[PDB]
Amino acid sequence: PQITLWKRPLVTIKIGGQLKEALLDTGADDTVLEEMNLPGRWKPKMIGGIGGFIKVRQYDQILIEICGHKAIGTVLVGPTPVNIIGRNLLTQIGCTLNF
Amino acid sequence: PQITLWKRPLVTIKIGGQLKEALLDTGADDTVLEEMNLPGRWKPKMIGGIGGFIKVRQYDQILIEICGHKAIGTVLVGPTPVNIIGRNLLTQIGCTLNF
């Protein structure tokens, strides 16, 4: 679809077999989701945002469906203010900015 | 134009008589610019993201040019690590997400 930006670009995602709402975030390199249970192995990592750095659990090669488009990539889990879909997955679903 | 997301969507902007590089950021409600000494009145504000909150100065009705597209709206000035063009101005230049 074509998404205008008068409202937050919030979409439904499916990850680990669960539905969630997430923000399509072109300013994020990486995808960061709020605390949740995910199967498989993870590794502790750090990520920085506008306010500083947080500790996250990095899950690699995770299947995630975004607004009906499939991606498989890295997902960071930690105390982010909101679920954000970053460019690592936005590229996989073919997302571009247009004006 | 059309901007793919393999790399950060950085564009040149013109604000307060200065040229700067800024992210086209669908994940930001507002526009947040690195510290600069703009004239006029402002209101204090706090905005939060990954890592917590930063203190910014809210200026209203600021003229900004984004890739030759003119806009006018609110800009928040503070210690952000990157210049962020948020949805309040992205709508004014006709920017959409497409996949």
Ligand SMILES: CC(C)CN(C[C@@H](O)[C@H](Cc1ccccc1)NC(=O)O[C@H]1CO[C@H]2OCC[C@H]21)S(=O)(=O)c1ccc([C@@H](O)CO)cc1
């Ligand atoms: C977290 C989002 C919900 C919100 N943010 C926008 C995001 O695009 C942010 C931009 C960014 C990019 C580089 C450094 C710092 C910030 N990207 C980000 O944190 O990405 C993380 C994950 O991937 C990595 O790559 C870059 C960093 C890592 S915010 O700046 O904090 C923010 C908060 C409140 C407002 C108010 O106007 C109300 O919205 C406006 C903007």
